[PDB]
Short mmCIF file of C-alpha atoms in Angstrom, two decimals:
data_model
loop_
_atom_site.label_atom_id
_atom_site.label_comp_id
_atom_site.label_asym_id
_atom_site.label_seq_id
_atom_site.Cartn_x
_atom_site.Cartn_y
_atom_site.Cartn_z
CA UNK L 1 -40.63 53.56 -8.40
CA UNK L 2 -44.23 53.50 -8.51
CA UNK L 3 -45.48 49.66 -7.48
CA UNK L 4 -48.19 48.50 -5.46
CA UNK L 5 -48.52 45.68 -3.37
CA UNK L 6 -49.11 43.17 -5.77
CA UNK L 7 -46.22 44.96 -7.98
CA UNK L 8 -43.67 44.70 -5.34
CA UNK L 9 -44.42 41.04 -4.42
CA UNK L 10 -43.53 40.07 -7.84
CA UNK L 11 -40.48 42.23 -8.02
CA UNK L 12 -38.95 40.97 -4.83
CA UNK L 13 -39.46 37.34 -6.39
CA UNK L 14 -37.97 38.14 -8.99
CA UNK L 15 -35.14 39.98 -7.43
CA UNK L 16 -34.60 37.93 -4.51
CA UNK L 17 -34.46 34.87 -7.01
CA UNK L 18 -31.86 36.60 -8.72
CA UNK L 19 -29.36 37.03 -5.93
CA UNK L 20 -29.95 33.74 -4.58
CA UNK L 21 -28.97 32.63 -8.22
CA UNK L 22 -25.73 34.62 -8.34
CA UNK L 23 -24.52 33.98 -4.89
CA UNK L 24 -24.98 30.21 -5.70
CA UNK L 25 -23.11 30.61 -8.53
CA UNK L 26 -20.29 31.85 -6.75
CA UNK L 27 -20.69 29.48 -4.28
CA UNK L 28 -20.49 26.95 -7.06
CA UNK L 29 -17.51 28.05 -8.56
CA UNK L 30 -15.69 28.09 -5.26
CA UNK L 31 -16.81 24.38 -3.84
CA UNK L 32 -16.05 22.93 -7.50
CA UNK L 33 -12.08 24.52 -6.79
CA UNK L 34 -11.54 24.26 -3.60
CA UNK L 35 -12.57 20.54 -4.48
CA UNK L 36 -10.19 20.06 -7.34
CA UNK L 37 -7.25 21.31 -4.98
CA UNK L 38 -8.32 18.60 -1.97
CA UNK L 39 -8.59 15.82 -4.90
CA UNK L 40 -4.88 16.42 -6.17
CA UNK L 41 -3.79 17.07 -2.79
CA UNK L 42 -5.01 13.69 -1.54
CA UNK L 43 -3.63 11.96 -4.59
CA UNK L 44 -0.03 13.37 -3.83
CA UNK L 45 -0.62 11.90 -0.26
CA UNK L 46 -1.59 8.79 -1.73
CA UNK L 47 1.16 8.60 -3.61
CA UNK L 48 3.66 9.19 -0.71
CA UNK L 49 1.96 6.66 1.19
CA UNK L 50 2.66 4.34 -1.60
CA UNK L 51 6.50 4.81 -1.43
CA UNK L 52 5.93 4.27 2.18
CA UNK L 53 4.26 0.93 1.72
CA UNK L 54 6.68 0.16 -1.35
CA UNK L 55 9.96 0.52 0.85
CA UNK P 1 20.18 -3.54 13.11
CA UNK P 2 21.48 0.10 11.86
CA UNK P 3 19.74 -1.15 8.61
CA UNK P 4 16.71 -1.39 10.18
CA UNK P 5 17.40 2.39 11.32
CA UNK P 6 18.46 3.73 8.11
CA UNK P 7 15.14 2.67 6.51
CA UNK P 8 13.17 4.22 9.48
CA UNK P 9 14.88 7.56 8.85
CA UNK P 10 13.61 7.48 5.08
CA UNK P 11 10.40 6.82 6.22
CA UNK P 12 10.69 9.79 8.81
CA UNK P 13 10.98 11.54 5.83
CA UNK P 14 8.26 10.39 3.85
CA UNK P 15 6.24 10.78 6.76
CA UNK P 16 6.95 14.23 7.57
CA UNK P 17 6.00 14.87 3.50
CA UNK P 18 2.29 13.17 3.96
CA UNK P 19 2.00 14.95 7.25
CA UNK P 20 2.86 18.35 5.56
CA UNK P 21 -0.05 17.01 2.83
CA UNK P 22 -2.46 16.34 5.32
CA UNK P 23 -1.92 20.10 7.02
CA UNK P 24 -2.38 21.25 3.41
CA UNK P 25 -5.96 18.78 3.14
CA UNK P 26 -6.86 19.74 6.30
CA UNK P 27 -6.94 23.26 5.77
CA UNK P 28 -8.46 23.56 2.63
CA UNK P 29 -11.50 20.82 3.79
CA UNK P 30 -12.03 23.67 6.39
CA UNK P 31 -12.54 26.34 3.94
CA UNK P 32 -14.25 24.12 1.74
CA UNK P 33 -16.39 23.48 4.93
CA UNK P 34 -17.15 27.19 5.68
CA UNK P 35 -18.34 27.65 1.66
CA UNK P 36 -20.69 24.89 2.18
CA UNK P 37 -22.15 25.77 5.15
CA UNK P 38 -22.51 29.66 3.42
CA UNK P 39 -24.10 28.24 0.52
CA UNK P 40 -26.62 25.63 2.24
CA UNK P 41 -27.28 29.11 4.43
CA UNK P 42 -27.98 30.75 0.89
CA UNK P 43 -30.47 27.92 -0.07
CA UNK P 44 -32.76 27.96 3.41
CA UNK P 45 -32.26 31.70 3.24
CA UNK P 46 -33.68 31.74 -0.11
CA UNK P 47 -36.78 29.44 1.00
CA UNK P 48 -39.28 31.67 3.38
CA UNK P 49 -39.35 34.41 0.64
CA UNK W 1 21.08 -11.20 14.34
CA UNK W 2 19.10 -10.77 17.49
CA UNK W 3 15.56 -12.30 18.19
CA UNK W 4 14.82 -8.23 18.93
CA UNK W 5 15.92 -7.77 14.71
CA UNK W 6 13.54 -10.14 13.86
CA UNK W 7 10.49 -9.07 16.35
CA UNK W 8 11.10 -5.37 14.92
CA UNK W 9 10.84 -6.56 11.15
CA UNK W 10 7.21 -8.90 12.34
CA UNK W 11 6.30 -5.46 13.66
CA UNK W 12 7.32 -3.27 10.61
CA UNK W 13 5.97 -5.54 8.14
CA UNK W 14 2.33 -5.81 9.70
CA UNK W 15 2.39 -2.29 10.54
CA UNK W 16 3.10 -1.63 7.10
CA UNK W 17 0.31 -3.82 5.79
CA UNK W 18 -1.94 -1.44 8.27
CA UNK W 19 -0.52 1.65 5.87
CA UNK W 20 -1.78 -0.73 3.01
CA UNK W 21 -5.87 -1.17 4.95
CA UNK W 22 -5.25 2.80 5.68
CA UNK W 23 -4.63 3.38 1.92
CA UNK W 24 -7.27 1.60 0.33
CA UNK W 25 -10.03 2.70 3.06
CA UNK W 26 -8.76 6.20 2.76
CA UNK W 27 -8.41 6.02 -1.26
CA UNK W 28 -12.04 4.73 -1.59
CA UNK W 29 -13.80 6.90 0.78
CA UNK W 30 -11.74 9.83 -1.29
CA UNK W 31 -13.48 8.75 -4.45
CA UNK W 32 -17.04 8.35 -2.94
CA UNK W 33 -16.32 11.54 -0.91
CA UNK W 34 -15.20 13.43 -4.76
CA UNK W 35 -18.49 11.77 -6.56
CA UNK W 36 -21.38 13.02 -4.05
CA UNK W 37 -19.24 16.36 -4.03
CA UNK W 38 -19.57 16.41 -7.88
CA UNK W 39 -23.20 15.10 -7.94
CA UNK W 40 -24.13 18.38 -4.95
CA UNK W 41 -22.53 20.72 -7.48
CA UNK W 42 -24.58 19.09 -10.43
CA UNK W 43 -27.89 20.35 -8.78
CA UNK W 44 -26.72 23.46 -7.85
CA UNK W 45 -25.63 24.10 -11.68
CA UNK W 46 -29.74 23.57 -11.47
CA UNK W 47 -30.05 26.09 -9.32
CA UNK W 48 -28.18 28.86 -10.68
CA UNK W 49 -30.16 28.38 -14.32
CA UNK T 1 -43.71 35.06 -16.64
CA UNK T 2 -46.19 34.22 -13.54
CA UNK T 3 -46.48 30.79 -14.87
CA UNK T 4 -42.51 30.72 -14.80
CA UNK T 5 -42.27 32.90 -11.45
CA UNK T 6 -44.07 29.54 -10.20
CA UNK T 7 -42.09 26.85 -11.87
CA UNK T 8 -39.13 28.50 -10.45
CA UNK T 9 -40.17 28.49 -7.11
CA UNK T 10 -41.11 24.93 -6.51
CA UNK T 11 -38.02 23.30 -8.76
CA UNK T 12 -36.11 25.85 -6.16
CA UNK T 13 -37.53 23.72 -3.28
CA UNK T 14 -36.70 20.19 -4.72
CA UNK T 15 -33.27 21.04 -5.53
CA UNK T 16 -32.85 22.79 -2.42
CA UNK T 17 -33.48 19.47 -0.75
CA UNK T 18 -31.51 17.34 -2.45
CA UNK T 19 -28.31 19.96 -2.16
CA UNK T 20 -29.49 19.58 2.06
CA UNK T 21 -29.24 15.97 1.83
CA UNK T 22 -26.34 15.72 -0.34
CA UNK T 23 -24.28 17.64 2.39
CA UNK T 24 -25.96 16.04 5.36
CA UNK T 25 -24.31 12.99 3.88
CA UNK T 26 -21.01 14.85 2.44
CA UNK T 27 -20.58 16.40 6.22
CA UNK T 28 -20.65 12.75 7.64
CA UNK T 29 -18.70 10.99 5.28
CA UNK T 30 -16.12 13.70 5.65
CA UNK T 31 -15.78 12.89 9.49
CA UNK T 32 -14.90 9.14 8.50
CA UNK T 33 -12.52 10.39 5.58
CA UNK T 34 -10.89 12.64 8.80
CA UNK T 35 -10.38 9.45 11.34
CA UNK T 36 -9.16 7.61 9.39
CA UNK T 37 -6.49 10.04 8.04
CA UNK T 38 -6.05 10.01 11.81
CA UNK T 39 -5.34 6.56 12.24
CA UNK T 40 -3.13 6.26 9.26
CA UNK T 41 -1.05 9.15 10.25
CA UNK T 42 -0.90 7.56 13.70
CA UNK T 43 0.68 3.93 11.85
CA UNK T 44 2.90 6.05 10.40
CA UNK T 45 4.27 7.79 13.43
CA UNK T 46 4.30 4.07 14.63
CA UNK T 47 6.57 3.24 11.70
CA UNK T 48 8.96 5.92 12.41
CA UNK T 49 8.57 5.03 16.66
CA UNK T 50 10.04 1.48 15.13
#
């Protein structure tokens, strides 16, 4: 409400750090599910293909 | 053979369950495509401040 | 029965042993695909800290 | 806080680059997982074509 040049420089590294943080994190949290629900999909595939080989 | 047509038709069946899998896969790698590509944006964006 | 049975089942059986190739080549790519995926979201669990 | 503003910035670079190659790499391996569901989809329609 009051900074300088030098002030604001540091606040917008800090800031800007911060959102880049968060966003990653939800970024994170999305990837890590979306990749749990392609691994058990494939493995379900797999497993048809099996019976398909196994017939 | 009609043995050799009976079998087919089970596998017409099992392959119409791995193709329904693979619409499933396919979908999901494309939204787990677009979060990637959001996130690597997130990361350059990030870099140049 | 006929020659055509048999010529059929050499067909069905190789083509089934290319299901078997597509399996494994699939399978393993699947895991190496789901270990650099889980390695990426180790540094970015860097990241966010 | 500086001193940390810092050590944040560069470690921010180095992992940055190693999430960039890790999905260079992810991106391309993905295309091979994808053609070769292709091809194995393709047996099986051969399978069912007898």
């Amino acid at each position: 409400h009051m900074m300088d040049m030098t002030q604001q420089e540091i606040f917008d590294k800090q800031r800007r750090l911060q959102e880049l943080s968060e966003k990653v994190r939800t970024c994170h949290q999305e990837i890590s599910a979306l990749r749990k629900a392609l691994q058990e999909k494939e493995a379900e595939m797999l497993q048809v293909l099996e019976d398909i080989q196994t017939i």
